[PDB]
Design an enzyme around this catalytic site. Sequence first.
Site, PDB file in Angstrom:
ATOM      1  N   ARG A 134      12.802  -6.970  -2.122  1.00  0.00           N
ATOM      2  CA  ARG A 134      14.468  -7.662  -2.539  1.00  0.00           C
ATOM      3  C   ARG A 134      14.466  -8.306  -3.564  1.00  0.00           C
ATOM      4  O   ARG A 134      13.325  -7.969  -4.463  1.00  0.00           O
ATOM      5  CB  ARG A 134      15.189  -9.079  -1.345  1.00  0.00           C
ATOM      6  CG  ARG A 134      14.140  -8.838   0.013  1.00  0.00           C
ATOM      7  CD  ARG A 134      15.759  -7.869   0.486  1.00  0.00           C
ATOM      8  NE  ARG A 134      15.270  -7.319   2.618  1.00  0.00           N
ATOM      9  CZ  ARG A 134      15.319  -6.613   2.483  1.00  0.00           C
ATOM     10  NH1 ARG A 134      15.406  -5.447   2.076  1.00  0.00           N
ATOM     11  NH2 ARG A 134      15.551  -6.428   3.491  1.00  0.00           N
ATOM     12  N   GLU A 143      20.678 -14.044  -3.165  1.00  0.00           N
ATOM     13  CA  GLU A 143      19.641 -12.959  -2.687  1.00  0.00           C
ATOM     14  C   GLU A 143      19.893 -11.667  -2.381  1.00  0.00           C
ATOM     15  O   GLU A 143      20.833 -12.048  -1.493  1.00  0.00           O
ATOM     16  CB  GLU A 143      18.021 -13.502  -2.276  1.00  0.00           C
ATOM     17  CG  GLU A 143      17.506 -12.691  -1.286  1.00  0.00           C
ATOM     18  CD  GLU A 143      18.452 -12.529   0.033  1.00  0.00           C
ATOM     19  OE1 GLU A 143      18.928 -12.443   0.855  1.00  0.00           O
ATOM     20  OE2 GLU A 143      17.612 -11.252   0.357  1.00  0.00           O
ATOM     21  N   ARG A 197       8.904  -5.744   2.314  1.00  0.00           N
ATOM     22  CA  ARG A 197       9.861  -5.950   2.325  1.00  0.00           C
ATOM     23  C   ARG A 197      10.587  -6.009   0.960  1.00  0.00           C
ATOM     24  O   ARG A 197      10.195  -7.215   0.583  1.00  0.00           O
ATOM     25  CB  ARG A 197      10.690  -6.550   2.875  1.00  0.00           C
ATOM     26  CG  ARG A 197      11.843  -7.526   3.458  1.00  0.00           C
ATOM     27  CD  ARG A 197      12.022  -8.669   4.640  1.00  0.00           C
ATOM     28  NE  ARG A 197      12.987  -8.401   4.853  1.00  0.00           N
ATOM     29  CZ  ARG A 197      13.736  -8.143   6.165  1.00  0.00           C
ATOM     30  NH1 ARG A 197      13.067  -7.581   6.975  1.00  0.00           N
ATOM     31  NH2 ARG A 197      15.585  -8.777   6.078  1.00  0.00           N
ATOM     32  N   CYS A 254      24.449  -7.453   3.018  1.00  0.00           N
ATOM     33  CA  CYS A 254      24.496  -6.278   2.346  1.00  0.00           C
ATOM     34  C   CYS A 254      24.677  -4.810   2.673  1.00  0.00           C
ATOM     35  O   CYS A 254      24.077  -4.031   2.222  1.00  0.00           O
ATOM     36  CB  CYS A 254      22.714  -6.427   2.706  1.00  0.00           C
ATOM     37  SG  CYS A 254      21.410  -5.619   4.496  1.00  0.00           S
TER      38      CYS A 254
END
Length: 327
Positions: A165, A119, A163, A81
């Site tokens: 995502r 993801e 969090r 990422c």
Amino acid sequence: MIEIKDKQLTGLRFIDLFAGLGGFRLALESCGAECVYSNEWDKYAQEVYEMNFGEKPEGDITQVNEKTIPDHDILCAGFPCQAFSISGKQKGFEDSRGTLFFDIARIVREKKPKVVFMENVKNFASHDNGNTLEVVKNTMNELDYSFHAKVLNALDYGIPQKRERIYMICFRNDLNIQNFQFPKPFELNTFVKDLLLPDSEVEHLVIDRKDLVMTNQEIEQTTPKTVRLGIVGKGGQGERIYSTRGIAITLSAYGGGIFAKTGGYLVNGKTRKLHPRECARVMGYPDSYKVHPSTSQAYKQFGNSVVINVLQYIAYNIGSSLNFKPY
DNA sequence: GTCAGCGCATGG
DNA sequence: CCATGAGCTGAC
Ligand SMILES: Nc1ncnc2c1ncn2[C@@H]1O[C@H](CSCC[C@H](N)C(=O)O)[C@@H](O)[C@H]1O
């Protein structure tokens, strides 16, 4: 993690790419599936994986012949990422850490698996004015897959952490799956204060700084949001203090600040950062998962991982859709 | 390899 | 205006 009674994925096989700690493996095995290959290049990530699962993952994915790879039903991958995160330089596909996606596409064309489960971080969906997400989508359609994607915040599924995502699920076109759905949210009943360790075990993590500035008073009732009580220094990353009556901030892997990688919390009159075990807990890991002997690497490992609970709920749904085959 | 001061895009 | 981020960079 949560307990699954109805094992929807018994009999299927999968592969763990960019393995890290093995977060995708725990979630999928709890549903009855089987692991047949894994790949992770970091020296220390390989040691923890071996300690817990009993096998060493292969190295560098960029120089592995895609035909060596075993036949499998689901492909799992939480690719790098750094090149897309909102905390970095946003160089995307011009970064040598941004091209990993194409090695996935390369493997996909050969093994033609049933499901592709990927993801990444929230900014992935907005990067380069939506162009980057489009590129991923089109490549998947062209290879004969359907593309389903959404952004999910962890505080909506039982774990106290802000969090966010983006999850991407893809089914092969000939299976004709028309009823997959992202899990529904529920109310949070656990807060940062319910996972903490006894005072005697975390004494060494305390920090008494003389440039402490309280800007808010401690709250008296719980809430599902990050509550900021104070600051040190200029208040940059790793210099912000929060309440144990709210939820934790996103954990990171290369961060700075005096309260590096976890952030600071006001615990019983004192200010300290989190212990590795407390990090495992806010990520959904069970107390039986053995952590790495080096405290420094343990923090980096947890900050690069995924939240188990969210992966479990999504895995159950993938199996339910595959098992609905009426006459 | 480890530590800590930092500076900016994004999303309200 | 105000808050955040599976980060960066230079020191030893
Ligand atoms: N070329 C490459 N080959 C193999 N692994 C790589 C790689 N480049 C990066 N990686 C690994 O990709 C991972 C990205 S983060 C993924 C974490 C994993 N989902 C978990 O459950 O913890 C890191 O472990 C990184 O070391």
